[PDB]
Design a protein around this ligand. Sequence first.
Ligand SMILES: C[C@@H]1O[C@@H](OCCn2ccnn2)[C@@H](O)[C@H](O)[C@@H]1O
Lengths: 299, 314
Amino acid sequence: KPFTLPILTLGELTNSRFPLPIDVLYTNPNESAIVQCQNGRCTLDGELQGTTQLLPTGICAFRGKVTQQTHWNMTVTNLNGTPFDPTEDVPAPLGTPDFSGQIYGVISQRNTLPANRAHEAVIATYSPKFTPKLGNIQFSTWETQDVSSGQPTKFTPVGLASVDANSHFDQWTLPSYSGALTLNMNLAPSVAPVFPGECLLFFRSFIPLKGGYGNPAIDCLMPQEWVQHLYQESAPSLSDVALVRYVNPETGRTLFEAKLHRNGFLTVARNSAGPVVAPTNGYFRFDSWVNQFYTLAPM
Amino acid sequence: KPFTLPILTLGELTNSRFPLPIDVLYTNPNESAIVQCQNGRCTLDGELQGTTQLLPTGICAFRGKVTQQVQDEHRGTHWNMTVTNLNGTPFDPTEDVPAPLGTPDFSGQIYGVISQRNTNTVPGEGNLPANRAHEAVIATYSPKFTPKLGNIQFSTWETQDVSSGQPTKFTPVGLASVDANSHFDQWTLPSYSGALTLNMNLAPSVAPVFPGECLLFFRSFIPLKGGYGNPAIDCLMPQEWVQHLYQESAPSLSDVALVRYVNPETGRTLFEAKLHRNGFLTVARNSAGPVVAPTNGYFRFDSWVNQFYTLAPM
Ligand SMILES: C[C@@H]1O[C@@H](OCCn2ccnn2)[C@@H](O)[C@H](O)[C@@H]1O
């Protein structure tokens, strides 16, 4: 069964690590951190890994119930409402955020015609109280009282609360899904170029801010639509590296080429940082299976 | 090119009319309103229609700029914002669409968050722009809701912290209210150019054309900022079907495709349905309410038939 990628321009793709459209392609060769994100992780033959799931509405979302108290403790279930089983071979409930920061969104409740309420809320994923693998998290509100206990609760993500020093935003620092003294488990593996002159290529989105100064961004290894496509196709991988070309359909010319690695990420032969300037109509097309000694044409 | 549907369970599908997961399949044979939604509209050979676009993040979203604070009789602080296309290019009112793609397609008080990132930077803050976000409501039935003209109005609880002339984003979250005075009706279209003007370039209405059949919907429940209610949004096809049909572009070999809802574990057909060329489903059922089916079920394409095919009763 032949391997394929969808035909979608950058303006038709969304981020797999936060609910945002893709804004630009991006490189940063001098990144010193280990890249080991857990959302947007899928092998080329269609195996989801980490905390990755298929719903665009599930990325950085939570479902559960508030237990007690401005901060509130919430037990979390699986996104489909079934109880989360901590013994399952996953790092945390699928969809759980995969980075350190103060995530800003809306908590809403519909009581078990029922009464309703919603408020702005913040979830600090670096907090010792952020233990989703144990089945519970904490969120804070500006609202001081009108949050009900024991009623079905939803968290809709919107952006970040802040990116100043005291807010610990770092997109490559994983949360401690079970707490500070416990090791994370069942992680999708780290990714990196394994050839001189190459660097990772990211799909970059800019993320909203509730206040303060800054222009924060979230980089993903593959867009959510690629995760969904690879899962459907389940095409066998015929080598460890696929050669793909970024083409201009109008002119028919290749703008640059890249390696698409079996574990699900891209590298290019580029020695600079920043956005990739390309026509709006461009997209990646599969060319052939190669190996780890293939020399990419410098972009 | 053979016609195909994706292999996705209800728990793997999302709504095409609001950013929500699909909760249940649903029927309502005695519906009196004309069904003519504009999001989630796609022919079986892949032609997007109405205000439909591909991004799940674009459904009921807006991008643009706030111009100034304005007066309005209703409770809150009100603001005018010009809107562009979702990709930032100017919206061209002469394009053959009802409104900018992504525009909401129903009457109601849509609740969400307005956020801004300034274009100018502050050297004292490391050459970085200032930001703000606040809860907001957009009343799609208001005479000031004129997206086809390039501008809309929204209200906030916050009284002052919204800047003029800065890039602005609306992220939808749910409804503000469903009380009588909030005019929620999922089948009543907005007046995209304002009161007393005729909407144009609409995706066509859908209806059964055979005795004993009714429309079948993918239903999601939508959050509420406050008040009583359990509101729902019904779409004709999920967003992942819109995305699949657009990619495949398979020619339609008749006006109706016969599809079966199968339980892959046992391999059995749970019920069958007609998938019409314009992009909607009908079933042979004479009751309203949810379809109770196993969690593993999904629709599978069987064959092209015609409008005189008799479906097996559900
Ligand atoms: C940078 C600011 O951050 C937030 O105010 C926080 C305090 N503050 C006011 C002025 N400087 N700091 C936003 O509410 C503002 O509109 C503004 O963007």
